[PDB]
Amino acid sequence: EEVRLDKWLWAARFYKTRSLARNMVEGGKVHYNGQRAKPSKSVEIGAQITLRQGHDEKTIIIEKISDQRRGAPEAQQLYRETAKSITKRERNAMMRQLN
Amino acid sequence: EEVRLDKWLWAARFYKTRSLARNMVEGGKVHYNGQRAKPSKSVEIGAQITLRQGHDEKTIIIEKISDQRRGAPEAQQLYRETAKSITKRERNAMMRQLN
Amino acid sequence: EEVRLDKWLWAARFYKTRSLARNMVEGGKVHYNGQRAKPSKSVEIGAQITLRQGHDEKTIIIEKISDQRRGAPEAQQLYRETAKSITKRERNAMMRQLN
C-alpha cells in the first residue's frame, strides 16, 4: 500500500535494479509532478512521473501501486504514458533517422 | 461529486476559462457520448468527450471526476486520449505542410 | 461480475460476434498474459491481452469488466492500448505501402 518511488519504478520495470532506479531519481533524471523528488517518496495514484529511458523522455501517470516486480506483461498495468509524451517521443525518434 | 461538463472541461484545462467552455458546448463543438449536450450535464466516469482544441479533434475518456482546476501536471489524470484519436490527430497533422 | 474472455472481447467490440471471438481464442489468435488461453478463462482487471484484428496485432490492458456490448462510444472505457503496441502498429503500418 505504501511503496517508494525507486521501488515503484523498479516494480514497473523502468529500471533493471532497485539501485539504478534510486540513482536515477537522485541524479535528478526523474520528476514527480514536475519536480525533483527523493527516492523514498511514496507513490500516489494519478501522480505524473517524467523519466529518462536511454534517449527517450517518458511521462507516465501512475494507475496502480505495487511493491512487486513481475513479468513484463503484468507490470504494464501500473502506468499509462500520456498522448503528449508518445507523439513527442516518436517525433524525436524520427529525427534521428533523418539526422 | 456532481460536476458540470463546462466545469469539468475547465478543471481538465481544455479551455482556459469556464465561460468559454460553456460557449463551446452551446455551439456544438463539444460532444458527449457522440451527441450534442447541455453545458450543465453532470459528467460520468468512462464517458466519451469529443472536442476541438484549435484545428485538431480530440476524443478522450473521463478517468476521474474533479471540480478543481489544478496545475497542468495534475490535470492529466482525469482523462486518457484513445489510440484512435491519437493516430488520427497525428495523421492529419503531418498532413498539413507536406500538402 | 464474472465474464468470459469470449464475452469480454465481444463486449469491448474487438470481434463483431461472440462466436468469432470464441474461435479466435481457440485458434490461438489471442494471448492472455503472454500465453494461449481458453475462451472460458475468467477475465481480470489489469490483465494483458494481445490480439489479431486485421493484419495488425494489438496489445491492450483490461480497464473494466462488462458483459454488455454497448455502443462504440461506450465500449472504449473497458480497455487501453499500450504506447508500445500503438507505435508498433504504425511502424509496421507506414512501412507497408511506403514499400
UniProtKB/TrEMBL annotation, chains A, B, C:
Keywords annotated in UniProt: DNA-binding, RNA-binding
Limits of the RNA-binding S4 domain: 3-66
Domain of life, source organism: Bacteria
Molecular functions per Gene Ontology: DNA binding; ribosomal large subunit binding; single-stranded RNA binding
GO biological process, one term: cellular response to heat
Family statement drawn from the similarity comment of this UniProt entry: Belongs to the HSP15 family.
Record's protein name: Heat shock protein 15
Organism of this sequence: Vibrio cholerae serotype O1 (strain ATCC 39541 / Classical Ogawa 395 / O395)
Full-sequence range covered: 8 to 106 of 127
